[PDB]
Amino acid sequence: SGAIYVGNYRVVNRHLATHNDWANLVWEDSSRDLLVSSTTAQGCDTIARCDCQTGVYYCSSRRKHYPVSFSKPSLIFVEASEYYPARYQSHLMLAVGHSEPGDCGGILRCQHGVVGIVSTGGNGLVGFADVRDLLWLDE
Ligand SMILES: N#CCc1ccccc1CC(=O)N1CCC[C@H](C(N)=O)C1
Numbered sequence: 380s381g382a383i384y385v386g387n388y389r390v391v392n393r394h395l396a397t398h399n400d401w402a403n404l405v406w407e408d409s410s411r412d413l414l415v416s417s418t419t420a421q422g423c424d425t426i427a428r429c430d431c432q433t434g435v436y437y438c439s440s441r442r443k444h445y446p447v448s449f450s451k452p453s454l455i456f457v458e459a460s461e462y463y464p465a466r467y468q469s470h471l472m473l474a475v476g477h478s479e480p481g482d483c484g485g486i487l488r489c490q491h492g493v494v495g496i497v498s499t500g501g502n503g504l505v506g507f508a509d510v511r512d513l514l515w516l517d518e
């Protein structure tokens with residue numbers, strides 16, 4: 380679990396969005412596993428606008444942060460789950476690092492701010508849904 384809070388927006392994994400997120404829907408994209416909802420309170424986070432490929436992510440299944448080298452956002456095949464059929468997920472970045480079911484929503488950050496959130500994983504890999512291209516989050 381986990382979310383990004385920036386301005387009057389809450390960014391969460393689409394498959395973990397609540398009834399309240401859907402009732403205050405701003406934008407969603409099943410192909411990216413992202414959903415953005417509106418909030419009444421101003422948010423705590425800053426979004427990176429960069430092309431960093433190194434950063435640090437929070438891993439809830441270890442209660443620890445880990446450094447990672449990650450691939451550029453791309454179209455990656457993701458196996459079927461209870462949430463989605465087998466499909467290509469877009470804007471996804473992979474890295475070697477621990478992740479297990481329950482770790483989605485952990486933040487990945489570089490020196491410029493928030494880069495994205497955990498969205499996939501398995502076998503010593505962790506995948507992050509990029510948010511750096513969503514320029515409208517800042518206005
Ligand atoms: N961290 C983590 C998740 C994880 C880690 C390790 C093993 C398995 C998983 C679960 C998994 O990859 N997904 C289930 C939920 C929806 C995700 C998607 N974006 O399509 C895919």
Ligand SMILES: [Zn+2]
Pocket residue numbers: 427428429430431489490491492
């Ligand atoms: Zn950066």
